[PDB]
A paper describes a structure:
Additional catalytic steps are acylation at the 6- and 6′-positions of SL1278 with two multiple methyl-branched (hydroxy) phthioceranoic acids, most likely through membrane-associated Chp1 to produce fully elaborated SL-1. FadD23 is one of the 34 fatty acid adenylating enzymes (FadDs) in M. tuberculosis.
Next, we solved the 1.5 Å crystal structure of M. tb FadD23 N-terminal domain. The N-terminal structure was compared with that of the complex with ATP or AMP-PNP, and the RMSDs were observed to be 0.4265 and 0.3836 Å, respectively. No obvious changes in substrate binding sites were observed. At the same time, after analyzing the structure, no extra differential density was observed, indicating that the N-terminus of FadD23 could not capture fatty acids from the same expression system. We inferred that the C-terminal domain serves as a cover for fatty acid binding to FadD23 and is important for the function of FadD23. The protein of the M. tb FadD23 N-terminal domain has no fatty AMP-ligase activity. Based on our results, we believe that the FadD23 N-terminal domain alone cannot efficiently bind fatty acids without C-terminal domain and the C-terminal domain plays a crucial role in the catalytic mechanism.
Numbering used by the authors: 4 to 130, 138 to 153, 159 to 171, 177 to 463
The structure:
């Protein structure tokens, strides 16, 4: 039913199984691991929940301003355990990033701020609500109020996407069914999650923090700076024992192919990697090819690479490639694409695009954004999305909610709901029964 309840079940079933392992490379370029079992992380979460209840009531917002690490995870889970609506943000980094933080805090109006003692002095100016240094609590002392609906707000004029447990669970059902379709929607026994994505991004939170609990497997986590410093670390950590499930944007596939150092890869066997999602940015076929052409020499399988389309307003996932096959690439004439039409062209020529199966859940339609009517196959329009993973709106923003989540189709085709539809702002088309993403409709 909810993340707190599923964490409790993880403890009941496998209290001594390793849940989260965080690798810090600041003090040793080989990495220092710190791990928690399910029982350890649950205890820490209960201790955070007890603290936050002293400051905030059920349904209040709890902003999280903490560096990447285990304290972030227990702050987020502890907020949920106490029935608070968590608001995951980044540590204060300066510049625009700090004015984003200030604007989110004024929008979400939190009654508690969860942080760490190391950055406490940087956090206090950014927030009167009590500020709790999570690492200074007695997190491992021996020791519910959760909601069943709204879990957290995902910001990314600040508009906080309201994400419910129903949204999360529906999106995980959709993801597990699509990613693992070739094994009957059953993940392998030795799956593990590996992520360096920041927890204040949708994919980093959903994969790094939520998925271990919902799927019931351990996670191996590090920070984005550790990856950027030495990109081979991503491959080293995915090559740990078991079948890794990871994710990154297109730029990081390119950077790893271009900058991972061969000697850091010596002896790695990438042939057990289950899935590497490529998502949150337009997926470039040329980048996927450079990545697989290099890392197939270490046994990476091309069917492990899964382009993934989505957005925070849909929790995270909308569509992905067919399980058990490498990405399908199709080619289209560029002059016609600029004119709004998809015209196939010879393999390799024109514009290469990833071809996605139309998802069975959620559903996708290509819609003319000025007439609210579905486009014929081949005509470019806005991608509209419908399904139980689609959020119910932006926090305390009725008007922006109507504009973004209130799409309504004129004369919908058979089997297509009138609405409400999430208007993604993304442009795309359907061609030969496959789905394609081009860009943004504003363009």
């Amino acid at each position: 039913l909810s993340i707190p309840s599923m964490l409790r079940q993880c403890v009941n079933l496998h209290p001594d199984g390793t849940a989260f392992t965080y690798i810090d490379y600041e003090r040793d370029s080989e990495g220092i691991s710190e791990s928690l079992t399910w029982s350890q992380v649950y205890r820490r979460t209960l201790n955070v929940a007890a603290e936050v209840r002293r400051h905030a009531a059920i349904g209040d917002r709890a902003v999280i301003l903490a560096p990447q690490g285990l304290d972030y995870i227990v702050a987020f889970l502890g907020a949920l355990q106490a029935g608070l609506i968590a608001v995951p943000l980044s540590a204060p980094l300066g510049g625009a990033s700090d004015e984003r933080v200030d604007a989110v805090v004024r929008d979400a109006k939190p009654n508690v701020v969860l942080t760490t003692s190391a950055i406490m002095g940087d956090v206090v100016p950014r927030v009167s609500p009590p500020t709790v240094a999570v690492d200074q609590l007695d997190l491992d002392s021996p020791i519910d109020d959760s909601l069943q609906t709204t879990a957290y707000l995902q910001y990314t004029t600040p508009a906080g996407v309201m994400i419910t447990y129903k949204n999360i669970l529906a999106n995980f059902q959709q993801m597990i069914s699509a990613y693992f379709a070739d094994t009957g929607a059953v993940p392998p026994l030795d799956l593990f999650i590996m992520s360096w994505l920041p927890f204040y991004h949708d994919m980093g939170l959903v994969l790094g923090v939520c998925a271990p609990i919902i799927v019931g497997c351990g996670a191996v986590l590090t920070s984005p700076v550790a990856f950027l410093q030495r990109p081979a670390r991503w491959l080293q950590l995915m090559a740990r024992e078991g079948q890794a499930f990871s994710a990154a944007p297109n730029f990081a596939f390119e950077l790893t192919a271009a900058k991972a150092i061969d000697d850091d890869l010596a002896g790695l066997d990438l042939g057990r990697i289950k899935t590497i999602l490529c998502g949150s940015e337009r997926v470039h076929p040329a980048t996927l090819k450079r990545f697989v052409d290099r890392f197939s020499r270490f046994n990476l399988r091309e069917f492990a690479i899964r382009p993934a389309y989505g957005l925070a307003e849909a929790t995270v996932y909308v569509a992905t490639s067919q399980a058990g096959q490498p990405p399908e690439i199709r080619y289209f004439e560029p002059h016609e694409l600029s004119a709004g039409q998809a015209k196939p062209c010879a393999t390799g020529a024109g514009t290469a695009l990833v071809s996605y199966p139309l998802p069975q859940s959620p559903i996708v339609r290509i819609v003319d954004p000025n007439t609210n009517t579905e486009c014929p196959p081949g005509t470019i329009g806005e991608i509209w999305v419908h399904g139980d993973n689609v959020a119910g709106g932006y926090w305390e923003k009725p008007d922006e909610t109507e504009r973004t989540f209130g799409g309504a189709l004129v004369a919908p085709s058979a089997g297509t709901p009138v609405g409400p539809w999430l208007r993604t702002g993304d442009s795309g088309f359907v061609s030969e029964d496959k789905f394609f993403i081009i860009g943004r409709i504003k363009d």
